Amino acid sequence: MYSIEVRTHSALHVVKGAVVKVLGSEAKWTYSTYVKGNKGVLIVKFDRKPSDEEIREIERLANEKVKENAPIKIYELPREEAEKMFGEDMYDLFPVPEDVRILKVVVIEDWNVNACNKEHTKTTGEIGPIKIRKVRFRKSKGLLEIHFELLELE
Question: Which residue number, 9 or 28, has a Cβ lying nearer to its own copies?
Answer: 28
CA distance linking residue 68 with residue 123, whole number of Å: 9
Contact 56, 148 (CB under 8 A): no
Name which of its own copies, Zn ion, none residue 7 binds, using a CB cut-off of 5 to 8 Å depending on partner kind.
none
In the chain, DSSP assigns E strands to 30-36, 39-45, 73-78, 102-108, 112-115, 130-138, 143-150
Site residues (CB under 8 A) for its own copies?
25-26, 28-29, 31, 45, 47, 88, 93-94, 140-142
- Chain centre to alpha carbon of residue 147: 12
Task: State in angstroms the smallest separation of the CB of 100 from its own copies.
Answer: 17
9 is in an annotated binding site: yes
Question: Rounded to the nearest whole angstrom, what is the least distance from the CB of residue 55 to its own copies in the complex?
Answer: 22
> Is 147 annotated as ligand-binding?
no
> Of all helices (H) and strands (E), which one includes residue 59?
helix 52-67
Q: Return the number of the residue (45 or 104) whose C-beta is nearest its own copies.
A: 45
Distance CA 40, CA 16 (A): 12
Q: Please identify, using beta-carbon distances, which residue of 51 and 140 lies nearer to its own copies.
A: 140
Cβ nearer to Zn ion, comparing 74 with 135: 74
What residues make contact with Zn ion under the rule CB under 5 A? 116, 118
Whole-angstrom Cα distance, residue 111 to residue 82?
17
Min CB(93)–its own copies separation in Å: 7
CA 48 to chain CA centroid, nearest Å: 19
Minimum CB separation of residue 50 from its own copies in Å reads: 17
DSSP label of 71: B
Q: Which residues are annotated as a binding site for Zn(2+)?
A: 9, 13, 116, 120
Q: Which residues are annotated as a binding site?
A: 9, 13, 116, 120
